[PDB]
Amino acid sequence: ETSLVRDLLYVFQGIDGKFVKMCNSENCYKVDGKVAVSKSLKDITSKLSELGWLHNKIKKYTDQRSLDRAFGLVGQSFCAALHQELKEYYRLLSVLHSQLQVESSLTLRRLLVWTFDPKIRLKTLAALVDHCQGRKGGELASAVHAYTKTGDPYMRSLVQHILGLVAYPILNFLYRWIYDGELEDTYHEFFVASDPVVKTDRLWHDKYSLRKSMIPSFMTMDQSRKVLLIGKSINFLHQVCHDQTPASKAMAVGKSAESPKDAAELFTDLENAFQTKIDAAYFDTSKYLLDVLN
Amino acid sequence: DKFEKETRGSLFGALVHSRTNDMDIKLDMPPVPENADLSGLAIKVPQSI
Amino acid sequence: LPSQETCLVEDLLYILIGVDGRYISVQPLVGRQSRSFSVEQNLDSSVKELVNRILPVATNYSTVTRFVEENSSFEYGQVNHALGAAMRTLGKEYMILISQLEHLQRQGLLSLQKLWFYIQPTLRTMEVLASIATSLNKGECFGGATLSLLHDRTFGYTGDSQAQELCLYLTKAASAPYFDILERWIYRGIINDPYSEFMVEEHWDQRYTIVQQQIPSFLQKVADKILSTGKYLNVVRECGHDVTCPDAKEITYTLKEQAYVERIEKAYNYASKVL
Amino acid sequence: LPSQETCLVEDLLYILIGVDGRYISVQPLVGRQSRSFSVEQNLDSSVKELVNRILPVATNYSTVTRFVEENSSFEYGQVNHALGAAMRTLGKEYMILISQLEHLQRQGLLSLQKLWFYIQPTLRTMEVLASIATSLNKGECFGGATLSLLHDRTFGYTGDSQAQELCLYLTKAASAPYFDILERWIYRGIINDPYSEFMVEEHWDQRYTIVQQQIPSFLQKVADKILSTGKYLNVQAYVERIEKAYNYAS
């Protein structure tokens, strides 16, 4: 009885438990390995099958990153998001281990429906990583936002919260380069790239190629066209020492406020509220650009 | 932090009853209602939230 | 020998889930609505006819959840993915009764008659989820004609309390996706969905593709008014202009299926004037 | 089978201190840089989950052993014993969490993965501090060169807020000695370097060296502006501190 009850808690925490199957690949599957066979034991192992494997998909990705400095932006921010749902997976597993060992009951039909709200949650989360196994920040942002286009508002809120957090370096790349010109991308995982061509004294020369093949699905193309000149017009005032935010100083306070404000909430990617004040930056830097010559 | 706390109360959706941050809750359904002994069991529809 | 009558109870609680028994076979046969479960006879002919009596009640549920919970996940943004997902929710709660019955089976506290009196309202709930799943495969419906069918359900049929009760919730929860983008077309003049569900898909202001295959969720009278709005909303696209004039018809939300006519009329004269 | 499992719950707490265990036998290979554990054999196949409690604690001890090799052989007060002290402080706050579990372990509660929710914020915390400590010690980094590594960690660890909070806190806890030495140079005009604490090493015709064994976290260009504040006094906004020093002097 109790042996297969304790096996499936241990596959939830990793692989094995009391018997060997040892699936670190494949589709994970449970072999009871007993002389006591019944036909309901066959249906319980197929219950286990997509619970343990879909847990293993998160482990395959965050150990594929092996937390590193190469892709230490977006690529590993995505592993960061998946680490917040890693824990919660362990949590329904700790209240079931609290029932088992003294604080008793085994797994039953009760526990059988309890897990099925994780079950559908891990089909979304396993599908979210299957979508995008590339290692670029621009095409990660087009992949997980396209899995928000689908129906079902139970998983729309679930992915919306992953999507705010994949986006937490991405909008952190955005507004500093807009107000001042700041960069940290040496890998080119910022969808706006830099230095394909040699860097010479400005005269309006190239140092930004935004790449018409990798734009985040939450941004629109005619806006990425506007921000390209905003990055160029401020970096072109590196031939004067005024590197400040152009026109109003009320834009510079915003980036500093915003990075805590996004963390604190439910990890929501604002992609039409953000679009309002990046219009007002295009409007700022063009009268400023003519007023330093005036 | 809002998203983390909300998930955690329901224990990754493995609770439907009460919000708890204890990991010492016993997962059990309730005994049959008294309104469910006069007509038999009936599934509650979550209307008007 | 008397023990075996309780043993077939415990085998029954797995039929309701949709899975294998310990002495009652499950056949995941081709076709839906009716798959046959083969009950292995045991001595005492009376308790075998009795179980055979309760057997179709578990059967008609077990087919209909199965294909529609996977089919829904394959949907592109359409209202049938919000619909199939709401069924799965009501399907969790059916299984609460399965596990509450198994809680009373620690030693026998129930009989086959005591089970039936309990699933007596859930038999009227399951038979009205049964016709939904068949009607949307007959048409091979997409998102505009799905809602056309479900409309007549929430404004027809009576016989149980619990049947109409479920059927208010799920039909508003299929219409509610539709409403969220509805305010997006009737004010902003954009679609978010991959296939729009309205009278027209997107493109002087007659340059449209009229799909009748995807039509509005109600009677045609609001549908004529959804076309007229999109003409004002085309003019601003035709030569650029303030498209941020509507928001004072968005301080209040729409959200009606008992008077969709009023909110569409208020979405019409508001769009006529700002032009 | 439940009884053997709750024994190794009690033996893990002793291991996590960084010391001898009981039936969990520990052997340093080359001076606590790697330590092989030899777990018992049991009739439970939760042996895999045992081997998954080894690797957290792998990185535990190797922070501490690496940072004391610096600080006891030269007595660094510029960066390495500073970071040794920030890390001993995260070590006290580690060990009180070890005491928080031992209080609980004299009741029936904790078992294998009951503890692993305490292990999880701390795992992210110690794995980055250890991948930090490997590169400082064995990199051969002292003075500014250490700061320059910690600076690259702030960049690399934007993903994950918990990861970001540690290298923020380490890179400022490593600079609070090293900034003070440059401050008296640019404010007062006195410097003494006994361990070569700052880049400028004396010996007007005294030199204003900017060395690359203490390469700066900041631009090489703005380090010149440090240098030359001190020239005329010698016989985020931490770069403006130097510029407002620099306008005073010339």
From Swiss-Prot, chain A:
Annotated family: Belongs to the TUBGCP family.
Subunit text: Interacts with gamma-tubulin.
Lineage: superkingdom: Eukaryota
Functional note: Necessary for the recruitment of gamma-tubulin to the centrosome and for the formation of a functional centrosome.
Name of the molecule in the record: Gamma-tubulin complex component 3 homolog
Cell location: Cytoplasm, Cytoskeleton, Microtubule organizing center, Centrosome
Species per Swiss-Prot/TrEMBL record: Xenopus laevis
The encoding gene: tubgcp3
